């Protein structure tokens, strides 16, 4: 029996994860402020990392990486890229402006962005979810729902450009995910810490008319696509939770 | 030559005192009967080990220590131990019944009856001092004596020895190692009361010591003897500058001067390597580069916390053994690239290094292997506030229900000293925050 | 020297008292003549906690024997370890207390209490450093209940700063001497709320259920009930009687166990209750099992404020720890979250005689409120109709005093309900 | 990376490597105030025990 608390009820994603944990019968949910827990779906702000890993005879895991805000604050990310000896050909100049003047345009219609979901487990394996989504291109402002998933976009690129999604876009996305996460690893790794971390990330990318991929930003508390909630939230339990708390692949490892 | 007087208060303080003075004697070549063939200054000397031992005409070397407990069973073991011959009886002071884990009982009720006697025995030692540097005070945050009578003694030492420095070695409470449910109260009470009277305090988390014992020494359930023998290595590394020829940390003022820019933020984090099991026959001798890299591993810290998420105000590397300056800078060059060592802006990004050539001594039969080189890193990092955050959170849980408060108020303490002390700690946490982020 | 003074009062008090002394005399190597005949010094290291050392290196229990009738104390003087108690420390009267709390507290016992306090004073004065008092008694009769709590009131006056603990047998209609038992228990509990630091609540119903259901004893005697109390009192006191344990006396123990002055009534438990020795998991499961609890309360009906548990025998400490940390980390709903680390454990190498491994449990649980609700209901059922009151107003008591006992125990019960939330 | 202030003797050496620049009356009153709250509480106990 494994115990877990919940401290972010607004989490679109982890509401589904704690939902699955109970449906295994081997996970028991505690009160939000009970400290004798195994796993914690923590809050987004001021999450008490300094109180983890001090409970005798508890292996404690948390769904966030202390120090990862450096990547996920738009301000901080600029600072991170400019002062890191690694890092720069895929991040727009940052301090017409906002700004990329020549974006690849879907046809018919004459602009979009690509969201990739990346999961980093306690061992710092980097897991790219197979399913991305193409969505100012925002649900807030706005195919069914202005969301086009990978197989269609692949099919478009083949018929329209004679190229694939993997070749023209996804080699660049994998290179970018690995570069940001490889860079911040010594600062955030919980490899020899008294508690353990994993975290889901939402990378936002742009494609220009030369099929160059650009990094827009990195989301630390990302929502998902309703169609993919099932698949991905189960993949979380499999790779990030049960790999530490075993019971009785939809990811590309980078 | 300026003398240093050690005071050990309560169980934890007395037992750690035992482990230290046993280790000091082996390092200094003093036998349990107090004789020291190395010392040819018979009945005297102004050598550096005379900072901690005085001499008798008979040739005996006598620790400048005072042991204090509110009940007798612990100091009674000193009195009938291997090193019974070392201490003058005047030096070992016990009372009738203990403080029962009750800060208010050690400070107010029982403490008032014994504080003048203790100060008088200490005064005896001070009077044998041509020059006096100050005091080293060993105690637990959690005992009723260790917390309560210590803060009464620290208040009075500021009055009665106002020019002298006071250093603290404090055992921070861990539920792994025999806590009581009330030690978060005692810890906050004693930290509030003592904070203005201490110049530098080294906190030892029993959870940290306990894990290092299980992981590195492979002791399934470590005993206090196991813990204390490891703690007295760290202490010895810290006090070695005072007992040996050297130019770094050669009096107690340098500790404040090297490690403490802001008076309130006076809790350096200690990190120590290598801790090698003695039942481990074939072991490889770690390099300077290697033992120095280990100082930045959270798992060798005296207090579990993550310095990567803080800022350094000072750092001091103390090596013992086969170590030359070239290898240290070599090692440091490399760790600057691979580690997260953020300094506060109004401070140089540097390291004060001291090298002692005599390699660490270990108790024969102990569980600690003899190594050819060890280091202790002393660093003032805001990350240690994590330990305050844990303690203050436990205090707030119990105190919101007033649990156990009545035991303190029944000893003449007032409920409002609980909140006076916790407001101090809220301030302290905010100081680390202003400095650190 | 951490001496404890023991008092046993009335029929029940002296009978569980005599057994406690048989059991712990066996562990300490003391024969029924007081001469030490053991094999380890671990046996002698804390022997002075409970024993004076008399002139020819005999050991004399530091025990005061009190009753208003001669009959049970002639029994003690004639049992196995009868010769071992100090003859001066038998203090008795001739009249009896007729199962009447007012005779014990107000009339008969008042005659006799100064003479008990004389023996108590003489045992205390010979104490290097007196650690506190323990009293064995039932709450359902007259001497142990009414005079017992009169003694405690007087010991407080004379030693206001020593700890006072009781082992108190609560009455149950299922194991009953007379109807007035709830009257005597209700008046007794109010005294204990104000005047003890620790009370071990031994429900005679639970002791009987344990012999009947678990031990398979179809017709249990007091002898069989008392054998359980004896083994529990021997467990509870192991950390005081045996070396190397926690450097803790009664006051330290009481401080850590009682978060609030009035909430100090504890549920004791014991395991096992055969030649197959129990594995450390089996001990930890039985100890926390409701069937092993001696207060006839459901712990899953309230919450543990604090818990203390000792394990006796040769067993892995790490294994004791994993099991203890498994029991807590599986039912975290039954421990209050606002007293961090409120479960404490110890191992002692010396196991009880006739056993290879044992676990004794001490729980400050808010489920204990169920026991006072039970006594309060029995009390009110009679008191609404002023039934059987004449036995009490004949000894000078007034109805007002019953009303106030009833009101204070109702208070106590709702005070427990405040903290289970 | 600079190495300043190097001192050597026979027991060892020390140096600094910079990698980058930038009352009795009051105590008496509190202790005795606590002793008088104890004493006042014990008087309420003995009063109550006398009633
Ligand atoms: N590392 C270590 N910790 C100890 C030792 N003795 C006690 N402790 C710890 O110190 C705390 C208890 O404090 P004590 O030193 O025993 O208390 P005390 O100062 O003697 O005061 P009293 O309440 O009067 O008994 C707990 O957190 C223990 O884990 C020891 O020899 N070594
Ligand atoms: N340099 C650039 N060139 C072109 N389009 C850009 C751009 N920067 C942002 N955008 C547009 O802005 C949209 C998203 O803006 P941005 O990611 O920076 O804020 P956001 O609202 O997504 C914060 P969050 O994802 O955390 O909720 C994209 O759909 C994209 O069309
Ligand atoms: N467990 C136990 N209960 C007893 C014993 N003798 C009496 N009782 C119980 O104690 C109550 C009667 O009180 P008792 O001790 O006999 O009367 P007293 O002499 O006036 O104090 C009843 O609730 C009985 O069930 C005994 O030897 N063991
Ligand atoms: C007479 C008497 C007496 C009174 N009051 C006690 C409170 C607790 C207690 O506890 C022991 O019960 C098994 C025990 O072994 N306690 C350990 C685990 C050592 C520490 N407990 O910390 C609270 C014993 C007690 C014994
Ligand atoms: Mg003590
Ligand atoms: Mg009877």
Chain B residues with CB inside 8 Å of A193's CB?
298, 306
What is the distance between the alpha carbons of residues A113 and A99, in angstroms, rounded to a whole number? 13
Residue for token pair 């125990």: C409
Q: Counting atoms of ligand 1 from 1, which one is nearest the CA of B106?
A: 24
Cβ neighbourhood burial of A54 (10 Å; 0-12, 13-18, 19+) = buried
User: Rounded CA gap, C327 and B187, in Å?
Assistant: 29
Beta bridge partners of B414: none
CATH topology (fold) of C368-421? Helix Hairpins (1.10.287)
State residue B218 phi and psi, 5-degree precision: 55, 50
Q: A66 alpha carbon to ligand 1 midpoint, in Å?
A: 34
State yes or no: cis peptide before B303, omega within 30 of 0: no
Distance CA B363, CA B343 (A): 37
Q: Residue C61 and residue C84: Cα distance in Å, rounded?
A: 7
CA distances from B345 to B311, B317, B336, B436, D22 (A): 9, 21, 17, 10, 5
Map tokens 């208070």 to a residue.
C411
Residue B25 and residue C245: Cα distance in Å, rounded? 30
Pairwise CA distance, residues B410 & B181, whole Å: 18
Q: Count H helices, E strands: chain B?
A: 15, 12
* CA-wise closest residue to C150 among C181, C180, C192, C94: C192
Q: Where are the alpha helices (H) located in A185-244, listed in sequence order?
A: 185-188, 229-236
Sheet holding C130-138, edge to edge: C90-92, C63-67, C3-9, C130-138, C163-170, C198-203, C265-271, C357-365, C304-313, C343-348
Spatial distance between the Cα atoms of B229 and B204, rounded to a whole number of angstroms? 13
- Quick count: other Cβ atoms within 10 Å of Cβ A231? 14
- By CB atoms closer than 10 A (0-12, 13-18, 19+), residue C385 is exposed
Nearest to C87 by CA among C44, C54, C131: C54
Q: Rounded to whole angstroms, what are the CA distances from C298 to C182, C295, C369?
A: 21, 9, 10
Identify all chain D residues contacting B247, using CB atoms and an 8 Å cutoff: 7, 9, 13-14
Residue B221 CA to residue B214 CA, distance in Å, equals 7
Q: How far is the CA of C240 from the centre of ligand 4 (A)?
A: 8
DSSP 8-state code for residue C36:
B
Helices vs strands, H then E, count in chain C: 15, 12
Q: In three state form, how does the secondary structure of C134-176 look?
A: EEEEECCCCHHHHHHHHHHHHHHHHCCCCEEEEEEEECECCEC
Q: Determine which helix (DSSP H) or strand (DSSP E) holds C51, and give its type and residue range.
A: strand C51-53
* Cβ atoms of residues B247 and D14 within 8 Å: yes
Tell me the two tokens of residue C352.
């009880």
- Give residue C139's Cα distance to chain centre: 11
What DSSP line would sit under A138-193, residue for residue?
A: -TTT--TTS-EEHHHHHHHHHHHHS--HIIIIIHHHHHHHHHHHHHSHHHH--TTS
CA distance C168 to C260: 20
Resolution number, Å? 2.5
3 state DSSP class of A242: coil
Angle at CA of residue C297, ends C296 and C299, nearest 5°:
140
Compute the CA torsion angle C159, C160, C161, C165 (nearest 10 deg): 80
B258 is in an annotated binding site: no
Long-range contact pairs involving C215-218 (C-beta distance under 8 Å, separation at least 24): C215/C273
Q: How far apart are the first and last CA of chain C?
A: 42
Ramachandran assignment for D41, one of left (phi > 0), alpha (psi -120 to 50 degrees), beta (any other):
alpha
**B and A: touch, per 3+ CB pairs < 8 A?**
yes
Question: What is the residue-wise DSSP string for C345-412?
Answer: EEEES-PPTT-SEEEEEEEEEGGGHHHHHHHHHHHHHHHTTTTTTHHHHTTT--HHHHHHHHHHHHHH
Q: Are C277 and C335 in contact (CB under 8 A)?
A: no
- Residue B203 near residue B301 (C-beta atoms within 8 A): no
Angle subtended at Cα C312 by Cα C311 and Cα C315, rounded to the nearest 5 degrees: 80
| Whether the CB of B143 sits within 6 Å of ligand 1 | yes
Q: And the tokens for C22?
A: 């048989």
Count other C-beta atoms under 10 Å from residue A143's C-beta: 11
Q: Backbone phi, then psi, for B278, in 5-degree steps?
A: -85, -20
Distance from CA of B297 to the nearest CA of A (A): 7
Closest CA to A225 of A233, A217, A216: A233
Residues of B annotated as part of the active site: 254
- Reading phi first (left if > 0) and then psi (alpha if -120 to 50, else beta), residue C127 is in beta
Question: To 10 degrees, what angle do helices D24-50 and B150-160 make?
Answer: 140
Helix, strand or coil, per DSSP, at residue C112: helix
- Does B73 show up as a binding residue in the annotation? no
d(CA B266, CA B386) in angstroms, rounded, equals 15
Residues in A lying within 8 Å of C, measured between beta carbons:
1, 3, 28, 30-31, 33-36, 56-58
What is the distance between the alpha carbons of residues B383 and A123, in angstroms, rounded to a whole number? 23
**Are B312 and B351 spatial neighbours (Cβ–Cβ below 8 Å)?**
no
How do C90-92 and A39-41 pair as beta strands?
A: unpaired
Residue B321 CB less than 6 A away from ligand 1:
no
| Pick from A67, A100, A252: nearest CA to A165 | A252
For residue D33, the Cα-to-chain-centroid distance in whole angstroms is 21
* Cα separations in angstroms, B184 against B103, B400, B406, C247: 11, 13, 15, 19
Helix (H/G/I), strand (E/B), else coil: C106? coil
Ligand 5 centre distance from Cα of residue B11 (Å): 5
| Residue extent(s) of CATH 3.40.50.1440 domains in chain C | 1-259
Q: Tokens at residue B387, please? A: 């330990």
> B308 and A187: CB-CB below 8 Å?
yes
Q: Which residue of B has its CA nearest to C338?
A: B397
Is A in contact with D (3 or more beta carbon pairs below 8 Å)? Answer: no
**Distance in angstroms (rounded) separating the CA atoms of residues B427 and B433:** 10
* Minimum-distance CB partner of B390 among A54, A187, A193: A54
Taking the C-alpha atoms of residue B392 and residue A48, their distance in angstroms, rounded to an integer, is 13
Q: How far apart are CA A90 and CA B38, in angstroms?
A: 70
Q: Are B66 and B93 in contact (CB under 8 A)?
A: yes
CA-to-CA dists, residue C14 to B372, B427, C103, C196, angstroms: 67, 57, 18, 19
User: Which residue in D has a C-alpha nearest to residue B328's C-alpha?
Assistant: D17
Fold of B384-437: Helix Hairpins (1.10.287)
Q: Which chains, if any, share at least 3 CB pairs under 8 A with chain C?
A: A, B, D
In 3-state terms, chain B is what percent helix, strand and coil (to 5)? 45, 20, 35
Sign (positive or negative) of CA dihedral A132, A136, A139, A140 = positive
Q: Cite the residue boundaries of each domain of chain C with CATH code 1.10.287.600.
A: 368-421
Fold topology of C260-367? 60s Ribosomal Protein L30; Chain: A; (3.30.1330)
Whether C329 and chain A come into contact, CB under 8 Å, resolves to: yes
| Summary count for chain D: helices (H), strands (E) | 1, 2
If you measure from the C-alpha of residue A92 to the centroid of ligand 2, how many angstroms do you get, rounded to a whole number?
12
How many Å apart are CA A109 and CA B169, to the nearest integer?
A: 72
How far apart (Å, rounded) are the C-alpha atoms in residues A222 and B88? 69
- Enumerate the residues of chain B whose CB falls inside 8 A of the CB of residue D11: 244-246, 356-358
10 Å CB burial of residue C71 (0-12, 13-18, 19+) is exposed
CB A199 within 8 A of CB A63: yes
Tokens read off for A33: 């402020």
The CATH number for B269-383, chosen from 3.10.129.10, 3.80.30.20, 3.30.1330.20, 3.40.50.11610, is 3.30.1330.20
Q: How far apart are CA A178 and CA A127, in angstroms?
A: 10
Task: Report how far residue A123's alpha carbon sits from residue C140's, in angstroms, rounded to the nearest whole number.
Answer: 64
Cα(A212) to centroid of ligand 2, in Å? Answer: 17
Characterize the bridge pairing of strands B65-69 and B3-9. Answer: parallel
CA distance C191 to C383: 19
In angstroms, the CA C153 to CA C156 distance is 5
Contact B53, B30 (CB under 8 A): yes
Question: Distance (Å) from the C-alpha of residue D41 to the closest C-alpha of chain B?
Answer: 8
Angle at CA B238, nearest 5°, toward B236 and B244?
75
Strand B373-381 to B312-321 pairing? antiparallel
- The arrangement of strands across the sheet holding A61-62 comes to A27-29, A2-6, A39-41, A61-62, A196-197
Residue from A150, A114, A144 nearest A130 by CA:
A150
Q: What secondary structure letter does DSSP report for C273?
A: -
Q: CATH code for A1-53?
A: 3.40.50.11480
Give residues with Cβ within 8 angstroms of B42, minimum separation 6.
B55, B57, B59
The structure tokens listed for D39 are 């004493």
Provide the residue count of chain C: 421
Q: Which CATH architecture has domain A54-92+102-254?
A: 2-Layer Sandwich (3.30)
Q: Where in chain A is the domain with CATH 3.30.470.20?
A: 54-92+102-254
Closest-CA residue to C367 (of C317, C294, C314, C311): C294
Is the beta carbon of B148 within 6 A of some atom in ligand 1? no
Q: Give pairs for B88-93: CB < 8 Å, separation 24+.
A: B88/B62, B90/B121, B90/B124, B91/B63, B91/B65, B91/B66, B91/B67, B91/B121, B91/B125, B92/B67, B93/B66, B93/B67, B93/B68, B93/B69, B93/B117, B93/B118, B93/B121
Tokens of A62: 């948390």
* B146 Cβ neighbours under 8 A, 6+ residues apart: B9, B10, B11, B12, B13, B106, B139, B140, B171, B186, B190
Distance CA C144, CA C67 (A): 8
Tell me if residue B353 falls in helix, strand or coil.
strand
- CATH 3.40.50.1440 domain range(s) in chain B: 1-268
The CATH homologous superfamily to which domain B1-268 belongs is Tubulin/FtsZ, GTPase domain (3.40.50.1440)
Q: Which two tokens stand for residue C409?
A: 């125990």
Q: Please report residues of D whose CB lies closer than 8 A to that of C197.
A: none
CB B210 within 8 A of CB B174: yes
B310 three-state secondary structure? coil
Distance CA A9, CA A18 (A): 10
Indicate the SS3 state at residue A201. strand
Determined by X-ray
For ligand 4, residues with CB inside 6 Å are C 134, 165, 198, 236-237, 239, 245-246, 250, 253, 256-257, 308-310, 344-346, 360, 362
A–B CB contacts, 8 A cutoff, strictly below: 37
- What is the C-alpha separation between C147 and C124, in angstroms, rounded? 20
Give dist(CA A120, CA A201) in Å, integer.
Answer: 8
C156: its two tokens:
């407080």
Determine the residue of C8, C9, C10, C12 to mutate for testing ligand 3's pocket, defined as the one with the most ligand atoms within 8 A of the Cβ atom.
C12
A51 and B175: CB-CB below 8 Å? no
Say how far apart CA C295 and CA C285 lie, in whole Å. Answer: 18
**CATH homologous superfamily, domain C1-259:** Tubulin/FtsZ, GTPase domain (3.40.50.1440)
Domain with CATH 1.10.287.600 in chain B: 384-437
Q: In whole angstroms, give the CA distance from residue B357 to residue B323.
A: 7
Nearest CA to ligand 2 atom 10: A136
- In the DSSP assignment, the letter for residue C196 is -
Distance from C-alpha of C74 to C-alpha of C91, rounded to nearest angstrom:
11
For ligand 2, say whether the CB of A98 is within 6 Å of any of its atoms. yes
Contacting residues of C for D46, CB less than 8 Å apart: 157, 160
Q: Taking a C-beta distance cutoff of 8 angstroms, is the pair B357, B372 a contact? A: no
3-state secondary structure of B324: coil
Angle at which helices B224-243 and B10-28 cross, to 10°: 60
How many CB atoms are closer than 10 A to CB A33? 11
């Amino acid at each position: 029996m494994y115990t877990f608390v919940v401290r972010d009820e607004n989490s679109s994603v982890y509401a589904e994860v704690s939902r699955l944990l109970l449906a295994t019968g081997q996970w028991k949910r505690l009160r939000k402020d009970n400290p004798r827990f195994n796993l914690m779906l923590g809050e987004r702000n001021r999450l008490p990392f300094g109180r983890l890993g001090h409970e005798p005879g508890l292996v404690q895991l948390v769904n966030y990486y202390r120090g990862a805000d450096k990547l996920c604050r738009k301000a901080s990310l600029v600072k991170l890229i400019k002062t890191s000896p690694e890092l720069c050909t895929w991040f727009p100049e940052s301090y017409v402006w906002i700004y990329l003047e020549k974006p690849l345009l879907l046809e018919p219609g004459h602009k979009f962005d690509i969201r990739s979901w990346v999961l980093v487990d306690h061992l710092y394996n980097i897991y790219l979810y197979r399913e991305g989504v193409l969505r100012l291109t925002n649900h807030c402002i706005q195919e069914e729902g202005n969301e086009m998933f990978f197989e269609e976009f692949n099919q478009y690129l083949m018929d329209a450009l004679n190229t694939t999604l993997e070749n023209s876009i996804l080699l660049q996305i994998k290179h970018i995910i690995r570069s940001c996460l490889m860079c911040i690893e010594p600062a955030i790794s919980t490899k020899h810490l008294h508690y353990q971390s994993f975290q889901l990330f939402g990378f936002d990318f742009m494609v220009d008319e030369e099929l160059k991929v650009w990094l827009i930003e990195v989301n630390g508390a990302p929502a998902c696509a309703q169609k993919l909630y099932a698949e991905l939230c189960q993949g979380i339990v499999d790779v990030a939770i049960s790999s530490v708390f075993p019971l009785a692949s939809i990811f590309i490892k980078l | 030559m300026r003398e240093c007087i050690s005071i050990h208060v309560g169980q934890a303080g007395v037992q750690i005192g035992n482990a230290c003075w046993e280790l000091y004697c082996l390092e200094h070549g003093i036998q349990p009967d107090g004789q020291m063939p190395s010392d040819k200054t018979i009945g005297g000397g102004d050598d550096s080990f005379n900072t901690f031992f005085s001499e008798t005409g008979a040739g005996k070397h006598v620790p400048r220590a005072v042991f204090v407990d509110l009940e007798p069973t612990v100091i009674d073991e000193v009195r009938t131990g291997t090193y019974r011959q070392l201490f003058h009886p005047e030096q070992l002071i016990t009372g009738k019944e203990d403080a029962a884990n009750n800060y208010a009982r050690g400070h107010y009720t029982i403490g008032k009856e014994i504080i003048d006697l203790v100060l008088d025995r200490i005064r005896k030692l001070a009077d044998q001092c041509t020059g006096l540097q100050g005091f080293l005070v060993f105690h637990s945050f959690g005992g009723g004596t260790g917390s309560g009578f210590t803060s009464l003694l620290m208040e009075r030492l500021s009055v009665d020895y106002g020019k002298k420095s006071k250093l603290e070695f404090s055992i921070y409470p861990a539920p792994q190692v025999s806590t009581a449910v009330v030690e978060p109260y005692n810890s906050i009470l004693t930290t509030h009361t003592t904070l203005e009277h201490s110049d530098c305090a080294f906190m030892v988390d029993n959870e940290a010591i306990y894990d290092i014992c299980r992981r590195n020494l492979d002791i399934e359930r470590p005993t206090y003897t196991n813990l204390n023998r490891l703690i007295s290595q760290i202490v010895s590394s810290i006090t070695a500058s005072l007992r040996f020829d050297g130019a770094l940390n050669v009096d107690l003022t340098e500790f404040q001067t090297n490690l403490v820019p802001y008076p309130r933020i006076h809790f350096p984090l200690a990190t120590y390597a290598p801790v090698i099991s003695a039942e481990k026959a074939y072991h490889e001798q770690l390099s300077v580069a290697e033992i120095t890299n280990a100082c930045f591993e959270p798992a060798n810290q005296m207090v579990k916390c993550d310095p990567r998420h803080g800022k350094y105000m000072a750092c001091c590397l103390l090596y013992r053994g086969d170590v030359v300056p070239k290898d240290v800078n070599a090692a440091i060059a490399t760790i600057k690239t691979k580690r997260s060592i953020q300094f506060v802006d109004w401070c140089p990004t540097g390291f004060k290094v001291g090298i002692n050539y005599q390699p660490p001594t270990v108790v024969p039969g102990g569980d600690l292997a003899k190594v050819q080189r060890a280091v202790c890193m002393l660093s003032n990092t805001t990350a240690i506030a994590e330990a305050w955050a844990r303690l203050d959170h436990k205090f707030d849980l119990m105190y919101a229900k007033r649990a156990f408060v009545h035991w303190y108020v029944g000893e003449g303490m007032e409920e409002g000293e609980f909140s006076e002390a916790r407001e101090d700690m809220a301030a302290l946490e905010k100081d680390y925050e202003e400095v650190g982020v | 020297m951490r001496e404890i003074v023991h008092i046993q009062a009335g029929q029940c008090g002296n009978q569980i008292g005599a057994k406690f002394w048989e059991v712990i005399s066996d562990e300490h190597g003391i024969d029924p003549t007081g001469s030490y005949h053991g094999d380890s010094d671990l046996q002698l290291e804390r022997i002075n906690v409970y024993y004076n050392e008399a002139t020819g290196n005999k050991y004399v229990p530091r025990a005061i024997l009190v009753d208003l009738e001669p009959g049970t104390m002639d029994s003690v003087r004639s049992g196995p370890f009868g010769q071992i108690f100090r003859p001066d420390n038998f203090v008795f009267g001739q009249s009896g207390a007729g199962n009447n709390w007012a005779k014990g507290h107000y009339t008969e016992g008042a005659e006799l209490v100064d003479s008990v306090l004389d023996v108590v004073r003489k045992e205390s004065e010979s104490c290097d450093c007196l650690q506190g008092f323990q009293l064995t008694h039932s709450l359902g009769g007259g001497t142990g209940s009414g005079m017992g709590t009169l003694l405690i009131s007087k010991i407080r006056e004379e030693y206001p700063d020593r700890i006072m603990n009781t082992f108190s047998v609560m009455p149950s209609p299922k194991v009953s001497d007379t109807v007035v038992e709830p009257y005597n228990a209700t008046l007794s509990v109010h005294q204990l709320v104000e005047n003890t630091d620790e009370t071990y609540c031994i429900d005679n119903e639970a002791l009987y259920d344990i012999c009947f259901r678990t031990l398979k004893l179809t017709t249990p005697t007091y002898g069989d009930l008392n054998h359980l109390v004896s083994a529990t009192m021997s467990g509870v006191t192991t950390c005081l009687r045996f070396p190397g344990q926690l450097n803790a006396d009664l006051r330290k123990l009481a401080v850590n166990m009682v978060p609030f002055p009035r909430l100090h009534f504890f549920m004791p438990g014991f395991a096992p209750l055969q030649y197959r020795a129990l594995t450390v998991p089996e001990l930890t499961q039985q100890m926390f099992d409701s069937k092993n609890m001696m207060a006839a309360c459901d712990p899953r009906h309230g919450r543990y404020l604090t818990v203390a548990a000792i394990f006796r025998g040769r067993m892995s400490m790490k294994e004791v720890d994993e099991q203890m940390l498994n029991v807590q980390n599986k039912n975290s709903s039954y421990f209050v979250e606002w007293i961090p680390n409120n479960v404490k454990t110890a191992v002692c190498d010396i196991p009880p005689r006739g056993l290879k491994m044992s676990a004794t449990f001490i729980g400050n649980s808010t489920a204990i409120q169920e026991l006072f609700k039970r006594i309060s209901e029995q009390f009110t059922a009679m008191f609404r109709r002023k039934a059987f009151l004449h036995w009490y107003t004949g000894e000078g008591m007034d109805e007002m005093e019953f009303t106030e006992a009833e009101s204070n125990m109702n208070d106590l019960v709702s005070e427990y309900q405040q903290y289970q939330d | 990376m600079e190495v300043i202030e190097l001192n050597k003797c026979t027991s060892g050496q020390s140096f600094e490597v910079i990698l980058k620049p930038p009352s009795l009356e009051e105590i008496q009153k509190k202790l005795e105030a606590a002793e008088e709250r104890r004493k006042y509480q014990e008087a309420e106990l003995l009063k109550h025990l006398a009633e």
